[PDB]
Amino acid sequence: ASGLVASNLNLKPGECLRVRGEVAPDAKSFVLNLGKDSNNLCLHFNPRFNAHGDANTIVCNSKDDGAWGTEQREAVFPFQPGSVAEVCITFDQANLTVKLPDGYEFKFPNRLNLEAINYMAADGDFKIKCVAFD
Amino acid sequence: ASGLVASNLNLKPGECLRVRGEVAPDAKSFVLNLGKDSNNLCLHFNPRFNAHGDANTIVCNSKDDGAWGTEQREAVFPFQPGSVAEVCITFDQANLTVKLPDGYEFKFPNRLNLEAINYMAADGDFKIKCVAFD
Ligand SMILES: OC[C@H]1O[C@@H](O)[C@H](O)[C@@H](O)[C@H]1O
Numbered sequence: 001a002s003g004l005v006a007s008n009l010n011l012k013p014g015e016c017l018r019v020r021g022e023v024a025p026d027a028k029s030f031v032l033n034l035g036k037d038s039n040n041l042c043l044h045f046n047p048r049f050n051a052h053g054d055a056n057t058i059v060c061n062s063k064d065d066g067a068w069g070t071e072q073r074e075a076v077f078p079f080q081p082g083s084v085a086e087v088c089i090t091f092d093q094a095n096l097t098v099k100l101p102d103g104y105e106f107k108f109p110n111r112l113n114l115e116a117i118n119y120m121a122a123d124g125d126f127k128i129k130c131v132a133f134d
Numbered sequence: 135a136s137g138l139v140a141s142n143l144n145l146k147p148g149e150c151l152r153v154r155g156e157v158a159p160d161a162k163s164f165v166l167n168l169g170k171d172s173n174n175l176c177l178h179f180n181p182r183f184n185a186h187g188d189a190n191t192i193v194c195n196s197k198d199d200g201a202w203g204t205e206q207r208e209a210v211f212p213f214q215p216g217s218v219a220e221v222c223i224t225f226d227q228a229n230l231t232v233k234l235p236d237g238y239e240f241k242f243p244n245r246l247n248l249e250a251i252n253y254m255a256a257d258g259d260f261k262i263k264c265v266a267f268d
């Protein structure tokens with residue numbers, strides 16, 4: 001009952017991952033994890049409506065062998081409870097580029113130095129409606 | 135080398151699962167599996183161009199607690215190596231309905247009596263590019 005989990009993605013540098021989902025009507029936060037596996041994440045994309053002291057804050061972090069890295073926070077929050085939201089994530093050797101619903105873009109360093117993303121997992125108040133790879 | 139693997143799909147009866155992927159240019163066949171897990175498949179969708187002694191025939195079968203059931207072969211074959219193909223799948227407790235690229239649709243008995251589909255997997259000859267739930 002958690003969220004969609006996909007493996008063997010083999011997303012190489014330069015490829016874009018497009019994820020469209022539904023934010024729960026009473027969402028507190030949702031997560032989109034990308035990486036090698038559940039313990040090695042190049043991107044922990046975590047928009048928080050109201051959770052852990054954050055109010056409408058997008059928090060991103062890396063996870064190397066189970067250990068969380070230094071969190072990064074964005075200046076915009078183009079997400080609304082009970083509404084469709086789409087995010088596009090591009091993979092590069094140095095950084096991951098994330099484009100939000102409203103077109104805002106930001107980068108998150110590829111700390112684990114992954115050469116390919118093979119794992120994706122969604123969880124929280126986000127019901128995935130479609131995923132596309134390129 | 136296998137294809138994409140998705141779990142926690144939570145596909146419910148009546149929902150439409152649209153899968154679009156690229157058929158390898160030198161594929162002798164390809165597989166799209168759906169079910170509870172790798173050992174319990176409500177649908178083993180296997181178009182065969184030239185494999186296992188068959189030619190341009192779509193072979194369907196189920197796998198219950200590891201055991202393969204009786205195969206069913208389809209009447210059409212709207213597939214070709216080295217091209218993009220999309221299939222649309224839905225189900226109820228009695229049957230699964232598979233719609234092909236040519237708009238043709240057939241039914242395959244839901245032998246596992248599944249009330250939800252949580253697992254999907256493609257092999258090395260079918261590269262999934264898009265997955266939708268509607
Ligand atoms: O640094 C990332 C982590 O931050 C925590 O506050 C949160 O509870 C975890 O689920 C994870 O998001």
Ligand SMILES: OC[C@H]1O[C@@H](O)[C@H](O)[C@@H](O)[C@H]1O
Nearest residue numbers: 178186194195202203204205
């Ligand atoms: O009916 C399903 C089965 O068909 C056989 O021909 C094949 O060798 C098995 O691996 C399995 O796919």
